[PDB]
């Protein structure tokens, strides 16, 4: 038992990271068969830091321009290209140690692991949430331009965040096929992040760790139905429950013999009356970066 | 000058459309080089057609099951693999008719053409946007499954959406790595589209081409801030106004001489009033399919 902001193993990816150079901009890579893939905001200098021009820069450089380096060992860059907002440098050498991989994209209120690195060099490991608004809250500092996040399913790395800016004390980042996640852009304009909301499904999987761990004294015997909970769930600023989402929980109501709309009777209550000065795993706060796959995943393993 | 929804020209994609099928099921799909890429869906009978597992179902098939046919011309399946939610399948011949493409993912707001197909024949082109809450309001009937949507800039085709399925009179759809636009899965559970707003800097470069057209009524002395505005605009139901958005409208407000924030005026002034019988551009209603790009393409070519 106990219950654990949890990541995965990160050896599968430490393998992967490495250090790119271009100029005096220095980023992370992550090197998969012959192929290496960074930020494409790695060809800029600041006088093209607010409104660059990528195409352009990309004309200008040559393959000797880049230095990629794998610890010690330095790649021979023989081809690059862009997609969409990330560079694809094609090297002389495939990593040996590639796993087998896949680039996915995720949604909102799913979780991943974030492998942080700098120069290269894998520094920590933490989990969190892609928020409602397409930002991570991450923990990063300068030099962290091209970290990943990912999941492992089976022996499958699925990687599906690469790290590009901080906003105002939030992180945003591309899929690993260059696509933004928000409505963001790799420059600096005036971008601020959305309004936030709280994962809904996502705090009543974790109630349901709860109750699974011990921690009962918010279940009550009432029961409610959809409509009137997602009523009071859009005064607090919560997402919608849908009818799939309730399916997604089955596997925990059976588990522990609480359906989901007794579950979100409790949920309500919280809501209205607050939690009083108790704690429930250890928070004094209602939280939403735990899925109900993680749940489960640390629960029932 | 006049204005009109227009799409872009469709030949580029035309020879790019071929039929798919697997079993009973029959769908299009777009050929490109050697590969096919379709919806995944196709490789499912009625049986699985409403919780599939897509990797045993693809396990159980072999290349010969896959009937692709180029107008007459039968292609010979050689391979094939998943990604995400489409598939992709090998194929003996490369298009020769294959145009200088990309694969981009649009942020909603943005507009495209789609060509809607059937059996892999081309039927009809017509220009939408996708909308905040990732559904498109397109116009598809059975059989238009793996239609795609695009952009040309250029001699380059953007590929920037493909057809899967109709929830409750809208559409929805991936990119052409397979990932969903929106909360949406391709099998058939209780999924329904969020809540929709209006897209106002839409809005706004329409109320521009109005102006380069003639139409000048709806103008009025006052200005405003962009915090007045978005306080009203929430009101009903309109996306705020960034600072970017107003940078985007920097052109258009060159050409006509009206300020951003002095057609936000009128904006506001419409939205509390309502037009009262006039029209603009033809229109009772106030249009937000139009993008600050498709005026200028259209109203300075
Ligand atoms: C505090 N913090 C949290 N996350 C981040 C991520 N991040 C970063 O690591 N670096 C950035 N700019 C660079 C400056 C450099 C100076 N040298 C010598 N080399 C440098 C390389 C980089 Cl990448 N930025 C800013 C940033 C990065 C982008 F990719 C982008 F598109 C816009 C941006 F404003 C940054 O956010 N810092
Ligand atoms: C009315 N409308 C508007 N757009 C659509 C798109 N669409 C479609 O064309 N076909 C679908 N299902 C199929 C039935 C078939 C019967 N035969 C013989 N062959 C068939 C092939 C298809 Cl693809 N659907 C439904 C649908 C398609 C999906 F890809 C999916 F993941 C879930 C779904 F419910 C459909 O929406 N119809
Ligand atoms: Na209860
Ligand atoms: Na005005």
Request: charged share 15%; aromatic share 10%.
């Amino acid at each position: 038992s106990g219950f654990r902001k949890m990541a995965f193993p990160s050896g599968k990816v430490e393998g992967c990271m490495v250090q790119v150079t271009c100029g005096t901009t220095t980023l992370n890579g992550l090197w998969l068969d012959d192929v290496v893939y960074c930020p494409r905001h790695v060809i800029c200098t600041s006088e093209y830091m607010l409104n660059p021009n990528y195409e352009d820069l990309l004309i200008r450089k040559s393959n000797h321009n880049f230095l990629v380096q794998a610890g010690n060992v330095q790649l021979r860059v023989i081809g690059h290209s862009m997609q969409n907002c990330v560079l694809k440098l094609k090297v002389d050498t495939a990593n040996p140690k590639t796993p087998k991989y896949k680039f996915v994209r995720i949604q909102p209120g799913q979780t991943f692991s974030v492998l942080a690195c700098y120069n290269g060099s894998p520094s920590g490991v933490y989990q969190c949430a892609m928020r409602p608004n397409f930002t991570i809250k991450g923990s990063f500092l300068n030099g962290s331009c091209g970290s990943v996040g990912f999941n492992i399913d089976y022996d499958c790395v699925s990687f599906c965040y690469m790290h590009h800016m901080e906003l105002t004390g939030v992180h945003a980042g591309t899929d690993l096929e260059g696509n933004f996640y928000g409505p963001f852009v790799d420059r600096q304009t005036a971008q601020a992040a959305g309004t936030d909301t709280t994962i809904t499904v996502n705090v009543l999987a974790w109630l349901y760790a709860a109750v699974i761990n011990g921690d009962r004294w918010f279940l009550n015997r009432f029961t409610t139905t959809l409509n009137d909970f997602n009523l009071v769930a859009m005064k607090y600023n919560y997402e919608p429950l849908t009818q799939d989402h309730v399916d997604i929980l089955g596997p925990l109501s059976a588990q522990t013999g609480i359906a989901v709309l007794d579950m979100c009777a409790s949920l309500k209550e919280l809501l209205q009356n607050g939690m009083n000065g108790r704690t429930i795993l250890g928070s004094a706060l209602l939280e939403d970066e735990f899925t109900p796959f993680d749940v489960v995943r640390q629960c029932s393993g």
